[PDB]
Amino acid sequence: TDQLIASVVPELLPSAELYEDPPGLEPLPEEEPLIAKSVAKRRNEFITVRYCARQALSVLGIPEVPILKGDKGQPLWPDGIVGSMTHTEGFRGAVVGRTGEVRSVGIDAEPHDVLPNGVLKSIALPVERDELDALPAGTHWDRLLFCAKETTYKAWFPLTARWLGFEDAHITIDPDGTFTSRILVDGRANDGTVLSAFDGRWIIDKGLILTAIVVPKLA
Ligand SMILES: CC(C)(COP(=O)(O)OP(=O)(O)OC[C@H]1O[C@@H](n2cnc3c(N)ncnc32)[C@H](O)[C@@H]1OP(=O)(O)O)[C@@H](O)C(=O)NCCC(=O)NCCS
Ligand SMILES: [Mn+2]
Ligand SMILES: [Mn+2]
Ligand code: NA
Structure with missing residues (x-):
């Protein structure tokens, strides 16, 4: 329910x-x-x-x-x-x-809390830091960004068999429960397509953040 x-x-x-x-x-x-x-x-x-x-x-x-x-x-x-x-x-x-x-x-699930000391600097691009500071009060956007980046890797890895670093995707979070991940590296995938961007969804409840990405089939 x-x-x-x-x-x-x-x-x-x-x-x-x-x-x-x-x-x-x-x-x-x-x-x-x-x-x-x-x-x-x-x-x-x-x-x-x-x-x-x-x-x-x-x-x-x-x-x-x-x-x-x-x-x-x-x-x-x-x-x-x-x-x-x-x-x-x-x-x-x-x-x-x-x-x-x-x-x-x-x-990916994370507790809805401020990130541990130093982690945000390690995982966020400079432009992302500025974007997070602009989002509305009342949500730990730093932890949400981290969660979303881990979800990005999980969706990416089975399609590429390659590493993706935190610095290799720009995630933009919308207050409406959606996010996008824009890939900054070679996106060639193992089915012959190119992965350039993912659409994600996010929810906070029960003291947790849950992010999800579905990569759809193509036509
Ligand atoms: C692998 C990783 C994403 C796990 O995420 P996490 O938030 O630490 O841990 P979670 O509990 O949410 O997920 C762990 C599960 O992820 C899954 N997982 C591990 N490696 C995986 C991979 N290469 N591809 C997909 N799923 C993977 C496994 O099912 C694991 O659970 P299990 O060991 O019990 O089977 C993370 O630890 C990591 O190493 N990240 C580095 C890469 C990254 O996040 N890049 C950012 C890209 S923008
Ligand atoms: Mn875990
Ligand atoms: Mn996680
Ligand atoms: Na590999």
Whole structure:
């Protein structure tokens, strides 16, 4: 009803989220090596986010399956599926969709708080600093910019297999719940197209920021 991800992605991309770790969850056997020596926060975020991912996959008709990690950390979905996952204090969530419907999806959740000391200087272009200062009072625009940049990478990486730095995209945030990401580097993609700009959506609720980008199919 009031799920954050569902508010920022199309209905044809099922999503699921939780705000706490249900007690007693375990990963699938194939997933255990990915968190073998991990601390409690990492184990629990990994397990619960995959619980949410499998719930969303079931809506698309896909029964229980491991969700392993690819070359540079990207989640590895079944044939015909794209998706994205995110976890932070107070949130685990996942979204999935069919490749016949969209090219890529990225999401990212952050607490709705001022960025840690020094992070804004590291991630924002000078022009972005000025733009954030101009936006209306009452939202942590610095944290929203950071969130949006991470969503940009998540949407970009499965389509390019290349790094994208914080300095390599200019994100413009609108108060209306949308943002744009303008790519400043070579945007050639692995399907033969060029990625120059992404359209994003954002919501703040439950003390969290959630950003999302869907990269549509082309004609
Ligand atoms: C990878 C990264 C984006 C993760 O974002 P984050 O906000 O720190 O963490 P989240 O909890 O939201 O997301 C973590 C999940 O992202 C996904 N992920 C990791 N690497 C990924 C990649 N290369 N491509 C897509 N998704 C990826 C994984 O599913 C991971 O969860 P898991 O390890 O449990 O499977 C971030 O840590 C990072 O390294 N960023 C550097 C690149 C960047 O953001 N550039 C800005 C471009 S403008
Ligand atoms: Mn996380
Ligand atoms: Mn994040
Ligand atoms: Na690579």
